[PDB]
Design an enzyme around this catalytic site. Structure first.
Site, short mmCIF file in Angstrom:
data_model
loop_
_atom_site.label_atom_id
_atom_site.label_comp_id
_atom_site.label_asym_id
_atom_site.label_seq_id
_atom_site.Cartn_x
_atom_site.Cartn_y
_atom_site.Cartn_z
N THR A 158 66.80 15.42 121.23
CA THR A 158 66.47 16.82 121.46
C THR A 158 65.36 17.32 120.52
O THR A 158 64.56 18.17 120.90
CB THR A 158 67.71 17.73 121.29
OG1 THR A 158 67.79 18.19 119.93
CG2 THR A 158 68.98 16.98 121.66
N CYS A 159 65.33 16.78 119.31
CA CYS A 159 64.35 17.20 118.31
C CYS A 159 62.92 16.93 118.77
O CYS A 159 62.01 17.70 118.46
CB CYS A 159 64.62 16.50 116.98
SG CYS A 159 66.32 16.63 116.39
N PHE A 160 62.74 15.83 119.50
CA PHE A 160 61.41 15.44 119.97
C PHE A 160 61.26 15.69 121.47
O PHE A 160 60.26 15.29 122.06
CB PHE A 160 61.15 13.97 119.66
CG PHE A 160 61.22 13.64 118.20
CD1 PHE A 160 60.11 13.78 117.39
CD2 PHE A 160 62.40 13.18 117.64
CE1 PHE A 160 60.17 13.47 116.05
CE2 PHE A 160 62.47 12.86 116.30
CZ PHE A 160 61.35 13.01 115.50
#
Lengths: 375, 76
Positions: free
Chosen positions: A347-349
């Site tokens: 999710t971060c990327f």
């Protein structure tokens, strides 16, 4: 703290009704969603019935996901309610998109007040059922919902010129210009002199009373003329969302709470996706992926967007301006693992690790299973 | 003659019509151009609603003149 914390507290503080049916039924026709939705919803005396799970059917269509149909209704009804053609709402300025209450609503339609209460109820239902309206109001609109005062600065975001014109009077001696406590407005091939106060046509604006002049112009532009309309709207909205409860949000958080887009534009989603580790727009696997996204329903698409981004709400302006935990992180699909593994997401990327599956059907089942697991 | 019909969105329409035309006719002409059922149209000239029966010259409407279109809310 921040927003995500308030919202949980908010939805949590929203009392569920126990003296109501387990569904709210609506049989609508797209060609007449406005009048169909108006009559159905305005027909019910007790707004509490509107808290029941929304059960909507367009044109006799059956078997479709309730949520997906509800999402479409909020989009379709928004496009109608907020259509300036009816004279209820209008665009704040030339080349501006934000919506404001048309002060002359009563001259376009005598039934405007009840339609304002209707739009308010729909807005309330949107917030109550965790859905969104398609359209954005001017900031003063949100401030009035929170019962906040409308000052000069509020004018800037709405009418930059008007704001500057008042800025000048505030910073200069206007006495010699012979301004009076009135304001002209043209309406339907006519002009109307309006009194900011009793005998305003006579009272000259000077250095000693220009402060009062400013304040009055602000109220007349945002508050006074649209008094009864905003009240009708707030009455409808507050029948679903407790007024005292929504005071925990500011004008910006409130806008986020009730406005935005429900589903995503796949063509825009596609055009601004980046590929890693061998994949490309024309790679067979990718073509399958976009074909999959293409034949998913509204509900499935969003569940995918959430599985890869963490959030289920789309960033306005499209995916061209998508953001990751740290800086603008475009939507990325990267080749990873073997066909035995389920796709994984960071999710971060905003990245989906998509194995090189050997068929569309396989890609569908695997992707769908991965999404369902983290549910 | 030429008349215009401004909408509440700012869009200005242009109609080719005769002074003898009834208000029913303009609504029809508007329907063909902007695809709007005439039974949903409200026409305003000089702050007055225009009635289907009368003609343009009945309201002293001449060329270059501007009518105002409003969509009808059926209330009830």
């Amino acid at each position: 703290r921040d927003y995500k914390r308030k919202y949980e507290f908010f939805r949590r503080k929203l009392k569920k009704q126990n003296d109501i049916p387990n569904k709210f039924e609506m049989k609508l026709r797209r060609a007449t969603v406005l009048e169909d939705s108006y009559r159905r919803i305005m027909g019910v005396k007790r707004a509490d019935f509107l808290k029941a799970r929304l059960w909507i059917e367009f044109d006799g269509e059956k078997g479709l996901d309730y949520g997906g149909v509800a999402r479409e209704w909020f989009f379709l009804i928004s496009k109608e309610m907020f259509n300036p053609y009816y004279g209820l709402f209008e665009y704040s300025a030339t080349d501006n998109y934000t919506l404001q209450i048309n002060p002359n609503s009563g001259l376009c339609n005598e039934d405007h007040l009840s339609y304002f209460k209707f739009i308010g109820r729909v807005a309330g239902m949107a917030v109550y059922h965790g859905k969104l309206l398609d359209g954005f109001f001017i900031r003063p609109f949100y401030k009035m919902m929170l019962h906040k005062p409308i000052t000069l600065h509020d004018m800037e975001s709405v009418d930059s010129e008007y704001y500057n014109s008042l800025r000048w009077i505030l910073e200069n001696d206007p006495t010699e210009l012979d301004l009076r406590f009135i304001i002209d407005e043209e309406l339907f091939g006519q002009t109307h002199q309006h009194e900011l106060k009793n005998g305003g046509s006579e009272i000259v604006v000077t250095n000693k009373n220009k402060k009062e002049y400013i304040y009055l112009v602000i109220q007349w532009r945002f508050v006074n003329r649209i008094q009864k309309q905003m009240a009708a709207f707030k009455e409808g909205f507050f029948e679903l969302i407790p007024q005292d409860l929504i005071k925990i949000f500011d004008e910006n958080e409130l806008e986020l709470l009730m406005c935005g887009l429900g589903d995503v534009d796949v063509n825009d989603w596609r055009e601004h996706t980046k590929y890693k580790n061998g994949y490309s727009a024309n790679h067979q696997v990718i073509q399958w992926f976009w074909k999959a996204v293409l034949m998913m329903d509204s509900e499935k698409r969003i569940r995918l967007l959430q599985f890869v981004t963490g959030t289920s709400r789309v960033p306005m302006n499209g995916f061209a301006e998508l953001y990751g935990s740290n800086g603008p992180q475009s939507f990325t699909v990267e080749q990873w693992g073997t066909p035995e593994k389920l796709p994984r997401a960071h999710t971060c990327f905003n990245r989906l690790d998509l194995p090189p599956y050997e068929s569309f059907e396989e890609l569908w089942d695997k992707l769908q299973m991965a999404i369902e697991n983290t549910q | 003659m030429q008349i215009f019909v401004k909408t509440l969105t700012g869009k200005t329409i242009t109609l080719e019509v005769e002074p003898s035309d009834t208000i029913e006719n303009v609504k029809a002409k508007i329907q063909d151009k902007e695809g709007i059922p005439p039974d949903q149209q409200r026409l305003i000239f000089a702050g007055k609603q225009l009635e289907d029966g009368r003609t343009l010259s009945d309201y002293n409407i001449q060329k270059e003149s501007t009518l105002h279109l409003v969509l009808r809310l059926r209330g009830g």
